[PDB]
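Quick one - inputs below.
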Amino acid sequence: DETVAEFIKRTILKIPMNELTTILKAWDFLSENQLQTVNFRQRKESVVQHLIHLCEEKRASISDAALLDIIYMQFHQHQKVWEVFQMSKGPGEDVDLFDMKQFKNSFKKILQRALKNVTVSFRETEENAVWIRIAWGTQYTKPNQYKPTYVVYYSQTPYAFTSSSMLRRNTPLLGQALTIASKHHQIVKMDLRSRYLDSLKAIVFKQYNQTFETHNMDSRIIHENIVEKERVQRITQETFGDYPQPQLEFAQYKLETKFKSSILAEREEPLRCLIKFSSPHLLEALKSLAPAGIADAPLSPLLTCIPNKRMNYFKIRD
Amino acid sequence: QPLSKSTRDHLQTMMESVIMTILSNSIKEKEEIQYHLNFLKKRLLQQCETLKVPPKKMEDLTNVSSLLNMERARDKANEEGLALLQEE
Amino acid sequence: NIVLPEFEKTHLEHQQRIESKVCKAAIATFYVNVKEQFIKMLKESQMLTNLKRKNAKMISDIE
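Output:
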């Protein structure tokens, strides 16, 4: 139909021209002999129109477009905000025997019996990763191809990543489907949201630190307070380590603590506050605060426990 | 309150169409019968203008069949979904 | 629903003037045609409104 062609055209237009050949090679839908016929030296619009002509000449379904969208999204994976989930199982359950076909069938059937019109697309890729693209819909509307939902699952692990696009009205349904298909008992949402998927992967699996130990100049200038400088350097090195820090860009704190300082001495109510830290590369600017003289030598634990406690949003009471 | 002009022009164009389709089969006594038809059509339009009816709101009638078909499809889909949910 | 009796008695208030057989036949034909059109239009309007409200009720119930 025309909707499929329009969706394919929009997807191709979204794809950059320099890496277009790689995307089409990875898609592996059109035959190889049909690729060299199109000249990529001309304008982008002419190439896009020619590819639309070729794909319309052949019988193209919506599955191919969904697979192309999945490939593009996993090649970019930085245009959306990702959230994490944690999954828990009973102590009396033995280790599960994971199977691809059973998981796919259960996940498809849960949504097919819950809703009526819904599109599901699967892609199994290396390091044991499963990408699921879901186009939502209901009984009285057709599935929407403009607001998809992306889910990344790791086999035999209690963690799953999701893209926060439109699931806010169907988040419990998605959680139930995930916890039923993979044979788990409870699902919870962790307070960890970020735009970089690799940083979340490193933090959740706590594999960001791989430093392992095994056996296998102007003397006329006098720097005073040198002992303080060496002490603060040692403290910073011990607290923040030496490994490259993961890349984060946001942190949020909520405070409900009392004010203690003559001033508001008789007040018995807390001082409600909300604080946001924003930076292109967090966890590295904070490392340079102590040497710059802006903060004290030992930083507050609320700022040096972001990767250890695996949280991004904090709430503090008295 | 008199009705809107949309239904008035709708009625007048249906009258024009029916007059044309009944005149297409006429062979004898051509011009006087169509003059009388136009006169009675104008008289009916005047009578409708002078009449009173509580107001009602809707849109153009050219999209009745498509809306009815999509409403039937939506009704069937909702009914089957509700039946499945109730059985579950 | 109120203009319908008026348009119904328009028939026999027009019958008292014309007397030609072919004109009478034509009058009756397009009169019954427009009456059928009016009835079908009103029924379609009512059932359209009923279907719309029923669809709204069912979508609310399923959600």
